[model samples]
Target: SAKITTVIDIGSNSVRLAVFKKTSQFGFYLLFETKSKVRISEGCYAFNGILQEIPMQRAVKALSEFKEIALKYKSKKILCVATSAVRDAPNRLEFVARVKKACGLQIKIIDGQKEALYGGIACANLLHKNSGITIDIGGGSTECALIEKGKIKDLISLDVGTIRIKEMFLDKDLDVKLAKAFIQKEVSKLPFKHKNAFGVGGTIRALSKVLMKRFDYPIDSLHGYEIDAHKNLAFIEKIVMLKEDQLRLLGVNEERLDSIRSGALILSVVLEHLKTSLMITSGVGVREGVFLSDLLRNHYHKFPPNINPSLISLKDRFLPHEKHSQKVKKECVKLFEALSPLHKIDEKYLFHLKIAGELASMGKILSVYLAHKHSAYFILNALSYGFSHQDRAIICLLAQFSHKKIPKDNAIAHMSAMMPSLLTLQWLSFILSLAENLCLTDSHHLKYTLEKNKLVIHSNDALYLAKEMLPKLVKPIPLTIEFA
Candidate 1:
């Protein structure tokens, strides 16, 4: 089905909506996007724990408007989520109840771990090829998640945010000792260990802008822009010493000046604690992850012709039935390469699809009945060789779904919400089912041809006669299978 999914993410500082259109081929493409920086934190943090009524009213109005736009676009589904500020506020329930009652919208206040995973997935999804940590500095908290190869490893959220920090320490007027102590205390709470870090969210973006101006950095692209640790520390120190007015004079946006110092201090401390030497910037965060999650649920196991290389490596490492899985993968890739015109997917994605097929049956080694699930759990929690946190989750999800039933909701609820799509799960599940049905006799004799949009499975024997066995392998998606 061709449809668009829209998501509204109401963060502490901004509210955003993004739309993604799904193609018949099961891949998604971005359609529209919008964002508004209302600085909701100003209302909650300004009064020392009380949520000012005005901002709540304004947010309700904003959400009401967003609902209208979503309906106009005929969005297939809409998911609204909130974070940090709302979660921390004592009167959040009251505010949330009102927003829902008045705007006909409900908000899910995600905890810090989920926030870290979502932001990490978004950053990992866009990474070119390297391992790093993703740090999202928000108004009420900082979320950090480690990504290796493109999959999430570990994630933690600290109660250190720009506005929160400003309220706590900015009034002290450049007290380096106090600020350092506070930052160190917060950094100590994070559980993950990593060497490289990626910065996300508005505060980090603003810092990058200021650094660009101060150092005459050549590029405007914040995504993947690298900052030297020493230079980053120096710039942050300069910002910390400057008074609010001096900061304004230096072209710091007035709205962000109050919190910039605390933000910089927090980042500086994290870098020091992690012993990080460089940072890469990413434009995506929690908002994008919401949309990606929806896409994955529907197309879990089916390869879109284009696949990522990291995912491919993971599939090879965790195949359930080594011989059978490899055979199917080989056949799938042969058809994939022959019908490149119909697929038209990037070679990178194709690589991921091939690997997914190659390792679909790795789960069978665990126990025929629950092998897929066991395989998935092992892949998700294991320290993958060449995959990042995001890739690991994707590969794991695919492996998990290769079984008959959908993976337990709780199994991947936390991790899946932090990832791009359930396709990772679905892809693995479908491939396994297909391979099993093709080799039902346990003889592993199957070949397939791809022409236009059709896949033809050819066999010398009457494979279709195993109707009962085939039914067990059939998935929710209608996959055509005919002997040629």
Candidate 2:
């Protein structure tokens, strides 16, 4: 069945392993992910890109342990790839052969172009956007790819990287002026320019985390986090000037303190050159791209239209009533369109409502008692692909109040900044509640229409079950209901 798939990415700065399990043909979730800062490229850049003894040994050890973890999880297929530092090294095969002997694993050293394509594939398929340029800062190189309407276009890998700059410039007798010149010389090679920048890799993530901490962002999720390139470049510039203690206070971890300045400077310079106004941070990168390239190889390397991997994964794991959930979704869309004239809600909110309908009963598998609350928790944490934090918050709140009354001001005040208006949320929740209730009986026979201020329901069969629960339905505004 080829159920469990493990992806190991040996980057210049770290070695990461991600394990995923498929629930359906297109539905899967990340089972486990772990990384080791072996820094196999530690001394390679300084010495003409030759793999050294200590770093190679550290990498082999990490690979051996990672192989154990994959076996422990019963991973059916292990996809291993090396990038940047290893790809550039003259002694790459020596290290690869040693790992093959020690860990019984074959390491595929992918070039910078393939690496950039992988980054583009990951962002295009997993992110909520379709057109943008991806910037992935690694240890030995930085990869950029152009995506247009969900397709990968021009891609390039530059020689500028955190470790490359560190060893070649920062650690040597060079100054910041020369380092900037080196980065600029490499940056001059970029071909495409896009206003929207999709940021990938550890350096960008580090910078985004610092910005998130500075703003006290409500959500803990980093994917789809947006930064105003013009406003935040100053803060990113400030990171290069701050001391280690100040960097720690700003959320730079101990593992990254040494290279954080180089990463920041590179990121700041690239963001400025790209002429980006909004930077969308992506948590998925080469590893995810590799995973999906194999998973969706036959499907044009993109998810099918109207299908979200996160929704499928949630339903696969937690939802016990697939047919019923589908019915609810049908009714939700039907009701949304029928009530469009009255609710005045945007068409965008309809997508959120549909997701809520599909995942509304997912928590019942855990416990039917307060299942709505359980569903909200799962949606908030696990519904992660192609959706923003605000999107997740709205879906979570909708599921939270699916069977309850309209939410109050204080109920969602914490995430209020990232959510729609209370009135809009109430309308979406009311629609979901109504759709879920409508599906209790033979909903196919039920037809709805808006008559003046009242929602008139018509049906051949007297919907006894529907009428009994209709009394609990909370109206979003001064609205009435009638039966015919």
Candidate 3:
């Protein structure tokens, strides 16, 4: 019988199993997902760096159930990996032995660095582009990896995970300053100074959840949800002030409350010390990474095969204005190629910018009165086909700035914080907005030039109205443009 592959990730906090169905084209489609947080580190690492029998027993039982699920799904192979709690335990080998004996499942305990590397690969794989760090703060450890030009350059695993810290120190209800010192001591050993970071694991995700609720940030915008250092610090303060009972009262789930404070402390210390303005949530972690590794090892022989589904899916959903969007993309790529003399921006951003133009009008299905805003919000909030959280935010912001309304300072501040250079957004908005205006009457007829910092639009028909709308869109930017 033909079979699919499943990857089981056993973490200190959660046990997750994901099955991927193999495709003829060497890609894998997600088939099934099951997760349960066993709090495996509940009291193990808190008292001493040893696996407690109670939680280990609970975890073994969970694995037994997962084995049945694999059998029910007819999985050909199931790979199980444990991290943090299991890795730190003195009796780890014994625990693995017991699990194998009871559940007929072989468990591999991976160090924090390897876990970080895999997580970085998974996130970079999703973005389909690279040049950033992936940070996965688990229950017992924090994994940090630097990704440069689509490759894992460096990785560090530190003892700063939420569960481990909470159990080790925070459980005693110490003051905030002591918790900060403890977190900083752990993170100080990490090699920092990355251009950008993709935050993973439950802690970061939980922080994002709190932010979403705090700011009434758009729902379904988990991947791209961003908070500046100040806002992030403010959130940390708020979360720290609350007791476990108050946290539950404020709607935080019971499982997350125990670890949330420690998690926030870890992130705050790292971000403050590194002086980075923003962190993008990966929405992926060890489970996805393990799954991706298995798929690439077994199914795919090439790279594009692994990414085509996401790209194709984005194309179908956006349904870009084929003629104009294509032309704008074509011209933008050419201009970007020329500008390579002055700026070293990656050309790959061109592809994403083009996709954004195509999908900028995706919200046209809503009321035309606010189509641009609607589309921007939709694209930002929806899980677009081939975008990471950062990719979606860039596209969303670009699309929003393409309209007649000028982007506000707050908006620019938001984007500038998340991405390193505003060149991508600035250039794309200028070109797309210009192209949109020139073709406002008949989008089929439009042409433009992007040289240096200047833009020139040539049209046979009079574009007085479009020209008037240009200033409205170009406010606060120093780019030069002329239309005739």
Candidate 4:
């Protein structure tokens, strides 16, 4: 049995703990998380990076509480690390000792390079995009890493950050032009440039949240969300000049009000320097990266071939009968291949159809009735890793309408851009429905043969239910089904 592990990250802006429960050897899910925005770097920037007594005490208090929470969860292993502020502090050892004495937690103060690598690892493994530049904006420093094809290539860290900029220029009431010049000069040192930029950390997430609200995005999840940087650059440029009230009206979170302008100015400068055109939001950052480092340490810090951590986790937690799921998956692809001549759908969709089949009975875990509806909800949220918003939406729609009838036009109208064509949806749904019905009969004894435009099923036991239901299934293309 794999014991639960709790990972703690003491960032310059906040302290957070995420507890992950390993369902199987290589499958795990986040059980719970807690955050405290203690601002451990507050006031330290002005004093030559000396540790402040108050902020250190606040951090200890939060760490002590985090220790208790982990104890309650029976977490066997706890990994604690600190970044930026703690690493740069003059009295870092003293603060680390105090935490050890008070909270019984040893703190590993990681340097900028390790911090950047953690962020890169998280995004590379979790996000759909394998190649991009990861921009992680923190309170005390900003770390950037170059990732290509799921491997981190290069990394650089700048002394410039939201709190660092605020204390040096914004809080000092210096000319905003001076702040811009400082930020521009620091980011100009970034040697690697890419059109695809992955935004990580709190400040980027906050900015993406505002953008999501401003545009009325259909999906509420932020991990795989994407936006055109050139189109939103104007909005980001304006955020630097907006007053507190104006920022609030723009939907900036209350906790980020003090440093929102500084963050926006820094991001605006980085975006301009990198000449990026696409920004993909990442909900996972250093915390998740730290967890994966431990989980996949044996496998060289990458998942095994043809494995999705999220899918494995869901099956480990909710699925009881692997044989049934395997049978359903087999039947789905077999039927898809058999219907290829008439459906004429792309072969790529077979991947989606297979996923839908593997998870077709996920909703039955909750209640047999309306299981499809529940499955859609689970797919939308629980399948949180390694999928784009469009892929998740397609899988959810397939699971949602797999029960009885074809989906109406209005059913998927909310996210038309992310969905496949209506005809494609109809054919995929019909195949899944047929595969589901086939599973109920003596599926092993059945043989499928397509003779031109007609489909024939030869079965040992008379498939009364399938014979009745197969004809009733909605078909996008005209075809006939007969069983011998």
Candidate 5:
């Protein structure tokens, strides 16, 4: 049994409280999270370096509320960490003192270097990027970590953020030429260089929302979500055309409107500076990085477990009763192996397909009718960490296709781009459906074989029922089925 841990991440844009319980040996599942747009670092905009009284009071109040919530969940080992805002604040000591006195929480103010380390740990472990730039855009600063061969080669935190930029430059009339030149100068000084980028922060998250809206993106996840750099740059060009009110009218979240233009511009400038055309938005940053980092520093003295943490953790929450799940997984693995000669798809796709089969019955608790649709929706919106956003989407679609006839869904566009082809979806989904049938009965006493192009199965009385499902579906390429 793992202990309950709470992390209070006090950042420039907001003060967030996240409660995660280590339900098993290597699984930490998020139980609860709340955010206060305290904008606690907004007062430090003028480089005054003083922690303003109003934001400090708001921080203390927010922390007290969060403390109560954590206690309610009976959390142990409550860790609090402050970012760039607190680090640069001249009156930070006084603010920290007041928090410790009133809220009884000691806040550790981590420098930009330390902040970059946490970001690197997360990028390497969760995102699984061996080499790339991980850029964390906070309200007060933007920290970039350059990693090579899975290690941090260089790290630097610039005094640039969505809030800071807006407060300083974009508050008046928007300036395309002037802003670009300034941002180019500021962004050009980074000690490292890279085209492949990973984005970490609310500003980036909000920027994703804007991009999603612009592109009519189907999914609502930022972690491991990929975007074209040119497209992002182009959006900033549009942002340059519109005034503040018009920018908000673009269907962005109201709270994000104020900083959207500046945030987008900063992101655009950074990508242009890196001369890159892609950025994978990360849901894991300082807060998650801090949790995993300290969790390792204290007990587990390493990076994340070799096995994917999110896979097990998510299954624990959504598919705890795994008897049937295990049965389907076995069926999937066997079929994937047997059909390899026919599918000719990479084994890389096999792992993802098997996971889909195991969790296919997630909506079983809700209803048997259209359970796959529910399963796909839940998986796409529900999962975070460990798997790339593209992989998760593929799994969700696979689960859906396994249970139902594949939909003419918009997400298939994104899915096809990630996978081998539309043919792969049909092939995998049919295999999963076949697997479900093989394990369809309560007693799934099963065996299988491959001869020529057909798959053969033996499962006593269930064989006929399983075989009947085979002819009902369409396949990208014909695959035969038999049972004994």
Candidate 6:
């Protein structure tokens, strides 16, 4: 347990090193992350599971590079683990010994179940889902974890992966039908139920990025981006038909050129198996899981449930208006409680509303006039690890337009589906604005009294802005404001 910790994940396709900085609390925020494509399992997956010579040397060099990166950040603790490739390799002992001898790194070869735990822990903690199935599609293998309430109920690791897919099927355009059928058969064997699908790997991210570009998606974030199976797979079918020469124009990574098509095919089959049209992409994976789960074991009983780890970690690391954030949160919650009858919203939304309050003035760090829009955009894009797409969108909407005017964009409307309604958006935005305004004077405790839909604020001083803001209220309800 050092203040600066690092995790080196040696995968079949890529090797990544993530350095995190721990604060006075248990959880740590990421300081820097880097990844290099090694393709360690490229030939091994086809060659009787024997580790390849060139790739082994490449992996050793990659570890040396990762170690240097960790040292540059002054990482006090470094943990290295090898998955799928090493576990499947018949000569794993020699590979591990060589890595340790060459790079002074002891590589732990974790079982499929353990690998699933790391992937599941990260997805379950970050995505704000009570229950779902997490699919970690790596170059080596795909692991499925049925996670509920931050716990993994069941875990399964399949030999079917992008690397294997590329070699097994999709070798030729004529093999497309056979590939789809084989992939579906493998996926069908997994007996599980899921409310949503959380995809955790580079393949998922790349797929989402290509889709975002195709639709000219407004938000430039891959973490919370999602797509329907039929819609995206239809696009993939077109990609599968493309000549290998034109894949460069499709925006896929040059390194993934060999496997991107296969990855997309695996994705289609996985979604079909999950029985969900919605595929939620996650940025966090085994490295994050290793860090968070380690922190959880340390905090054990002290950790609170349902609190946003990204909010806590990033807020502590970046935001300077902690006091004002707390004040706004206090006032916002007060208004939401007092005016509940009019909004007709649920209690679950209160958490996100509070998050909006906490982040109301975040963008003021850079600009004052453009703060609200910047805050909204940042929430939608940056808080991917801690909130669901819908909740993150709610937080974004709650932060933006902190006044009477609501956005008319279809993108905003799509994001606001959970809290749908122009009036509801107006009231939530106004509540945030009112809270920010109330805390502007550093008022600690303010009394709010409501009588027949008319609200009166009893601060220790006169409030002209609160009164003027009252006339802008929507919801076809009268909420007159006064102050004493």
Q: By lDDT, who's the top model here? A: 2
Candidate 4 lDDT over 355-469, as tens digits, reads 9888988998899999988887888888878887777777887788885555564443346365678778778877887888888755675667899899887778877888777
Clashes of each: 38, 0, 0, 0, 0, 0
**Residue-level lDDT for 464 in candidate 1:** 51
Which candidate model has the greater lDDT, 1 or 4?
4
Q: If both were scored by TM-score, which would come out higher, candidate 3 or candidate 4? A: 4
| Per-residue alpha-carbon lDDT of candidate 3 for residues 275-368, written as tens digits (9 for 90 to 100) | 5665776666677677666656544212454355444444444543366556656655554554445455677677667766666666776778
Off by over 4 Å in 5: 128-130, 170-182, 297-305, 408-410, 413-416, 441-450, 458-476
Please give the distance, in angstroms, between residue 372's alpha carbon in candidate 3 and its true position after superposition: 14
Candidate 1, position 13, lDDT: 74
Stretches of candidate 1 off by over 4 Å are 23-30, 43-48, 171-176, 245-251, 298-484
> lDDT per residue, candidate 5, 1-484, as tens digits?
1388888989888899888787566667678988998888765676576777888899899999999998999987788999888988888899899999989999999998989888887786677455789878878788888877667778887877777776666654556667667777878788667767888888788777777787777777778788777756776667755776876766777787777777777777787777766788888877777777766664423454366667677777778888988888888888888888888888888877888887888987678899988788777777667576778877887888774456555464354255557677777888888778777766455776778876777665645565667676566576677775
Stretches off by above 4 angstroms in model 6 are: 171-174, 230-233, 236-241, 298-303, 367-369, 413-419, 442-445, 463-479
- The better candidate by TM-score, 1 or 3, is 3
Q: Lowest-scoring 10 consecutive residues by lDDT in candidate 4?
A: 409-418
Q: Report the CA-based lDDT of candidate 1 relative to the real structure.
A: 0.66
Task: Please report, as a residue range, the 10-residue window in candidate 6 with the lowest summed lDDT.
Answer: 298-307
lDDT (C-alpha) at residue 129 in model 3: 41
How large is the C-alpha RMSD of every model relative to the true structure? 16.0, 2.0, 7.0, 2.0, 3.1, 3.0
Which lDDT tens digits does candidate 6 get at residues 144-170?
A: 988777667888888778887776565
Displacement of residue 118 (Cα, Å) in model 6 is: 1.2
Query: CA shift at 196, candidate 3, in angstroms?
Result: 1.7
